[PDB]
Amino acid sequence: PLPFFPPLYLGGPEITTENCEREPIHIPGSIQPHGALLTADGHSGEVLQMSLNAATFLGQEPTVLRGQTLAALLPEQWPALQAALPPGCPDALQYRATLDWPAAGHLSLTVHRVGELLILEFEPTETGPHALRNAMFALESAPNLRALAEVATQTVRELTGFDRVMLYKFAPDATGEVIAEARREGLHAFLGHRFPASHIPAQARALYTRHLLRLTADTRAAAVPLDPVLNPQTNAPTPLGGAVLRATSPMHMQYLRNMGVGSSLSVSVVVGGQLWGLIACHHQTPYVLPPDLRTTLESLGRLLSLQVQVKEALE
């Protein structure tokens, strides 16, 4: 991947189709507005950054949260959080808990660690695992790779109710082909369609080998900045590749709108450490898939990755 541009907030250049592989998608300095995000020092728990919308979810102003400790804000979770994510743990490891809040439903908390920084995501949440347990029989009995792909896309559609679910396989030249598709009756088919490599550029493919699920809940929603935008530990951008709330590339969001997609989600299929493909999902309207369903999709992605490796070895 040819070197990243600075983000727009550090004076970087505008993105065009001539340089899109240089967009620093991992450090947008902003989040999707269906949740809130805090970052905190990994030893002290001092809150270092806050999404500007944090008052809507946490009930205190961003500027008042800044500098407070997670021991003060989350006294019941802090010791567990800190034990679960020790220094040097994988940046994909998550601590999850459910918090009570004044509004309807609960608040889901998801935390991961990058270097000395803890990144906390808060999202409102008002049958999946057992449905997945059941689907494993048909995934196992699938006779070959294409049959497995067909079962996988139908299974994902059943779990999620997404309008369209595709298995998008990368060729060695990074072009893609839709090798299986489950879709709502009425929808035009992408099955068999092939696409240039530019649609999922090299830096995206690299990120997707490390952090295996990403989404855009509402393809017209404006991003919410982090404040301060730079991590004070480093005076540098905050890596958000491990946060589902990370703001999506505006170039990709424009692609999705042009395609008539209101909500998008994909899960990586990783085989021998290489990005083999994506389970790629669309909805016609905005849709926040709940955290527990996302966890189910992650698990299915891992299972599918392994089955692909096993079915491919039959050849």
Ligand X SMILES: *C/C=C1/C(=C/c2[nH]c(/C=C3[NH+]=C(/C=C4\NC(=O)C(C=C)=C4C)C(C)=C\3CCC(=O)O)c(CCC(=O)O)c2C)NC(=O)[C@H]1C
Q: How far is the CB of 28 from ligand X (least distance, A)?
A: 8
User: Residues 103, 126: contact at Cβ < 8 Å?
Assistant: no
Q: How far is the CB of 136 from its own copies (least distance, A)?
A: 5
Q: How far is the CB of 266 from its own copies (least distance, A)?
A: 17
Residue 216 in the binding site for ligand X (CB under 6 A): yes
Q: How far is the CB of 248 from ligand X (least distance, A)?
A: 4
CB proximity list for 47: less than 8 A, separation 6 or greater: 38, 39, 40, 65, 66, 67, 68, 69, 70, 73
CA dihedral over 97, 100, 103, 105, signed as positive or negative: positive
Q: How far is the CB of 48 from ligand X (least distance, A)?
A: 23
- Strands of the chain, DSSP E: 30-31, 36-41, 47-51, 95-99, 106-114, 117-125, 164-170, 176-183, 194-195, 213-216, 224-227, 230-231, 236-237, 263-271, 274-283
Residue with smaller CB distance to its own copies, 136 or 189: 136
Q: Which of 278, 293, 297, 300 binds ligand X (CB under 6 A)?
A: 278
Q: Which of 160, 264, 268, 296 binds ligand X (CB under 6 A)?
A: 264
DSSP H helical ranges for the chain: 54-58, 62-65, 70-73, 78-84, 128-141, 145-160, 202-210, 250-258, 291-313
Instruction: Choose from ligand X, its own copies, none: what does 296 bind? Cβ within 5-8 Å by kind.
Output: its own copies
- How far, in Å, CA of 175 to CA of 169, rounded? 8
Residue 200 in the binding site for ligand X (CB under 6 A): yes
Instruction: Choose from its own copies, ligand X, none: what does 292 bind? Cβ within 5-8 Å by kind.
Output: its own copies
- How far, in Å, CA of 271 to CA of 53, rounded? 38
Q: How far is the CB of 119 from ligand X (least distance, A)?
A: 16
Question: Phi/psi class of residue 241: alpha, beta or left (left: φ > 0; alpha: ψ in -120 to 50)?
Answer: alpha
Instruction: Choose from ligand X, its own copies, none: what does 303 bind? Cβ within 5-8 Å by kind.
Output: its own copies
Where on the chain is the footprint of its own copies (CB under 8 A)?
Answer: 90, 92-94, 96, 127-130, 132-134, 136-137, 140, 292, 295-296, 298-299, 302-303, 306-307, 309-310, 313
Q: Which of 204, 212, 213, 300 binds ligand X (CB under 6 A)?
A: 204
Instruction: Choose from ligand X, its own copies, none: what does 58 bind? Cβ within 5-8 Å by kind.
Output: none
Nearest residue (beta carbon) to ligand X: 20
Residue range at the interface with ligand X (CB under 6 A); choices 82-90, 93-101, 119-127, 263-271: 263-271
Rg (CA), the chain: 20
Question: Phi/psi class of residue 206: alpha, beta or left (left: φ > 0; alpha: ψ in -120 to 50)?
Answer: alpha
Please name which of 239, 7, 27 lies closest in space to residue 119, comparing C-alpha atoms. Answer: 239
Q: Which residues are annotated as a binding site for a tetrapyrrole?
A: 20
User: Residues 241, 48: contact at Cβ < 8 Å?
Assistant: no
Contacts (CB under 6 A) with ligand X, residues 4-43? 17, 20, 23, 25
Q: How far is the CB of 270 from its own copies (least distance, A)?
A: 9
Instruction: Choose from its own copies, ligand X, none: what does 267 bind? Cβ within 5-8 Å by kind.
Output: none
Interface ranges with ligand X (CB under 6 A): 17, 20, 23, 25, 176, 190, 195, 198-201, 204, 214, 216, 248-249, 251-252, 255, 264-266, 278, 280
